[PDB]
Amino acid sequence: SGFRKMAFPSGKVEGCMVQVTCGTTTLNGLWLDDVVYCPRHVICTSEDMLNPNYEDLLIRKSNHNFLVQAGNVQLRVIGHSMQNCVLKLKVDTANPKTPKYKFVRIQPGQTFSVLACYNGSPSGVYQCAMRPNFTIKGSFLNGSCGSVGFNIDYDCVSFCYMHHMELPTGVHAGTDLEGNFYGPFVDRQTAQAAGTDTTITVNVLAWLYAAVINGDRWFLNRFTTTLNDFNLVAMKYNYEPLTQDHVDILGPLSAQTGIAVLDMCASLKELLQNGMNGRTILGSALLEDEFTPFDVVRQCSGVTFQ
Amino acid sequence: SGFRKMAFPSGKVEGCMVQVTCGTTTLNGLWLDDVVYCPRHVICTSEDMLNPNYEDLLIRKSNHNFLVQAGNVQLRVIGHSMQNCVLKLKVDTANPKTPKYKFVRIQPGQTFSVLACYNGSPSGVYQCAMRPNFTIKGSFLNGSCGSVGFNIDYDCVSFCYMHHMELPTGVHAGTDLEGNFYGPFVDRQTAQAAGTDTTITVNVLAWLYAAVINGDRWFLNRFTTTLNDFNLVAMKYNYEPLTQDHVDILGPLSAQTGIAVLDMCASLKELLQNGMNGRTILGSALLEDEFTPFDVVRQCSGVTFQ
Numbered sequence: 001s002g003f004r005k006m007a008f009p010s011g012k013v014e015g016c017m018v019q020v021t022c023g024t025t026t027l028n029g030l031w032l033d034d035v036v037y038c039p040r041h042v043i044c045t046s047e048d049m050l051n052p053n054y055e056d057l058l059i060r061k062s063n064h065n066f067l068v069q070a071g072n073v074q075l076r077v078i079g080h081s082m083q084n085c086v087l088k089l090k091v092d093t094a095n096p097k098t099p100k101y102k103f104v105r106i107q108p109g110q111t112f113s114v115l116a117c118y119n120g121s122p123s124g125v126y127q128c129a130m131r132p133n134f135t136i137k138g139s140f141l142n143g144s145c146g147s148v149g150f151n152i153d154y155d156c157v158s159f160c161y162m163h164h165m166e167l168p169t170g171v172h173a174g175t176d177l178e179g180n181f182y183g184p185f186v187d188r189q190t191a192q193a194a195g196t197d198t199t200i201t202v203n204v205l206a207w208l209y210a211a212v213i214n215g216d217r218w219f220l221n222r223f224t225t226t227l228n229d230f231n232l233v234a235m236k237y238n239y240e241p242l243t244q245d246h247v248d249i250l251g252p253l254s255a256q257t258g259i260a261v262l263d264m265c266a267s268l269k270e271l272l273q274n275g276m277n278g279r280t281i282l283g284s285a286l287l288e289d290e291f292t293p294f295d296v297v298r299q300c301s302g303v304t305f306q
Numbered sequence: 307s308g309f310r311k312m313a314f315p316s317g318k319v320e321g322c323m324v325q326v327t328c329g330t331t332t333l334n335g336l337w338l339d340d341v342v343y344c345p346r347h348v349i350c351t352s353e354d355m356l357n358p359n360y361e362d363l364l365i366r367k368s369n370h371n372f373l374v375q376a377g378n379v380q381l382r383v384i385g386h387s388m389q390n391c392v393l394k395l396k397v398d399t400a401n402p403k404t405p406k407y408k409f410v411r412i413q414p415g416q417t418f419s420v421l422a423c424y425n426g427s428p429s430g431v432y433q434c435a436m437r438p439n440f441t442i443k444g445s446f447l448n449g450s451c452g453s454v455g456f457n458i459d460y461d462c463v464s465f466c467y468m469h470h471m472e473l474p475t476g477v478h479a480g481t482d483l484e485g486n487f488y489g490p491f492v493d494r495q496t497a498q499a500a501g502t503d504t505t506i507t508v509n510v511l512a513w514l515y516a517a518v519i520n521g522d523r524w525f526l527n528r529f530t531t532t533l534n535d536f537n538l539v540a541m542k543y544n545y546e547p548l549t550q551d552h553v554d555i556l557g558p559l560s561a562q563t564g565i566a567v568l569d570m571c572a573s574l575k576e577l578l579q580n581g582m583n584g585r586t587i588l589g590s591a592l593l594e595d596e597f598t599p600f601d602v603v604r605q606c607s608g609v610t611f612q
């Protein structure tokens with residue numbers, strides 16, 4: 001038992017991280033087979049990143065303007081192209097550590113692990129969710145651009161996120177691995193801001209099931225509610241609506257605990273209307289929304305990856 | 307910016323995890339050079355683990371009673387011995403993935419990363435602290451015995467923890483890598499229980515500094531206090547005493563924020579006496595004590611590992 005915000009083992013991704021330098025900008029790249037992926041704003045300078053034209057900036061570059069460092073070895077760039085907001089740097093060596101991988105785009109509400117990197121060297125790993133407003137509440141400093149987010153499904157790394165920028169509220173925005181931003185953010189230095197967020201209702205319910213599984217039951221009650229009457233309460237507390245597909249996804253957890261999904265919604269209603277009254281759930285005094293039903297089954301049942 | 311509970315990249319440790327089977331018990335082992343380390347209770351059976359004599363149990367075992375699985379390869383055990391509560395299984399192959407490593411024993415209050423494993427396959431990574439009562443609040447199921455806790459200092463893995471058991475409150479107990487338990491726990495199935503815990507004061511203060519660095523300042527005040535008058539409040543709220551060495555360790559963070567350590571203690575006093583009044587700090591409605599001053603400097607400055 002116990003419940004922790006748990007990331008995937010990062011080894012398979014560590015072997016893909018490299019350092020990309022262009023001009024006086026250094027950031028991280030992702031080396032798979034003979035391609036290095038990195039944020040296109042690497043080709044910009046301080047006065048470029050105000051309002052850049054990336055097609056213009058890139059045509060003025062040469063293969064030799066890109067320095068790729070794989071640990072303490074020199075990768076020769078033999079080609080370069082832009083794909084949306086990422087650069088693809090063709091190099092003369094295939095990464096021998098290339099795992100089986102996919103490029104997938106995730107939904108707000110889903111989670112992934114982040115391997116934060118600086119100068120191509122991995123620094124730490126942690127678990128994030130894609131917020132409903134398409135930002136992520138990450139932990140990122142100067143130099144961290146190009147760190148990636150991923151999930152692991154058996155032996156295959158599904159890359160879903162590459163870091164590009166920090167917004168004024170301290171949250172982070174980036175792209176999928178085909179270079180398409182999550183949310184309405186652009187890789188240029190405007191006054192852009194996050195925009196209003198919501199709480200991920202199905203995840204909160206999943207985490208309440210994790211708490212029951214781990215022995216926290218004080219918030220349970222004999223009450224029930226209808227889906228429609230629950231969603232009225234959700235809207236007022238800026239939770240997002242619960243759908244029948246969410247109820248279905250919570251079925252296994254419902255079955256395992258014997259607590260009907262709509263019964264747990266009634267528990268959530270009461271928590272939203274009364275608060276917790278000085279008590280905690282799974283070591284938190286807040287309702288946690290960054291665990292999916294999958295994450296909970298994973299950790300409260302024990303699946304591995306090879 | 308941002309602040310996350312961040313673990314070390316796990317790759318260097320993933321390459322050391324193996325599966326150890328003896329009888330009908332399977333758990334995890336740690337393979338360094340030509341030795342596999344694992345909890346000694348692997349040699350016990352259901353009726354053995356009540357009150358075992360491990361010297362008796364081990365003399366009745368042979369090298370061939372230990373099955374060591376390194377992925378999908380067979381390691382031949384060529385020797386076995388007991389060192390306190392761990393077994394050392396001499397195998398006929400040195401682990402080619404052996405990192406530079408040390409065996410260190412940590413202090414309550416210090417943190418480490420855990421690579422939870424099942425059947426020798428790594429499942430997830432997360433960050434824990436050694437509680438003042440020598441337990442850890444981990445996330446561990448059947449089969450997870452022998453997963454290890456570690457820190458990384460540049461390229462060298464300092465192993466500090468190997469998992470042995472879950473206590474009735476759902477918290478976890480284990481040993482250092484020389485087999486000596488943390489705390490007053492034994493690898494036998496008694497009625498043993500955690501014992502009373504305290505909050506790690508210096509860590510809370512460090513985390514308050516992380517919050518200031520990240521823009522949370524609402525809990526700051528013009529008040530100050532003396533170390534003695536702070537420690538009077540700490541005792542009443544079951545925080546542990548703050549020492550002058552703690553004040554010194556918090557110096558860099560103090561300097562960086564311009565908030566004197568004793569000023570931040572006065573802020574902590576007020577938080578303990580008034581609570582937070584519906585506000586949050588770094589996304590928490592509780593005072594967090596599982597980040598050390600080092601962890602905070604690490605994440606709010608950006609050190610890597612190679």
Ligand SMILES: *C(=N)[C@@H](NC(=O)[C@@H]1[C@@H]2[C@H](CN1C(=O)[C@H](NC(=O)C(F)(F)F)C(C)(C)C)C2(C)C)c1cncc2ccccc12
Pocket residue numbers: 027041049140141142143144145146164165166167168186187188189190191192307
């Ligand atoms: C990458 N290592 C770094 N981010 C950038 O360099 C991007 C890049 C340039 C500015 N930028 C930013 O993240 C923002 N800028 C913005 O315009 C904003 F707010 F997103 F709209 C700054 C935080 C630097 C002002 C362009 C082309 C958008 C990076 C990544 N994560 C965190 C972080 C923290 C501090 C400095 C740089 C950071």
Ligand SMILES: *C(=N)[C@@H](NC(=O)[C@@H]1[C@@H]2[C@H](CN1C(=O)[C@H](NC(=O)C(F)(F)F)C(C)(C)C)C2(C)C)c1cncc2ccccc12
Pocket residue numbers: 001333347355446447448449450451452470471472473474492493494495496497498
């Ligand atoms: C290892 N994979 C497993 N732990 C054990 O097998 C140890 C081992 C036997 C019993 N044990 C336990 O962790 C406790 N037993 C206790 O006696 C206690 F509470 F610690 F005092 C049980 C939780 C199984 C009752 C001995 C020799 C102490 C393990 C490790 N982590 C979690 C976990 C959860 C469920 C089952 C087994 C678990």
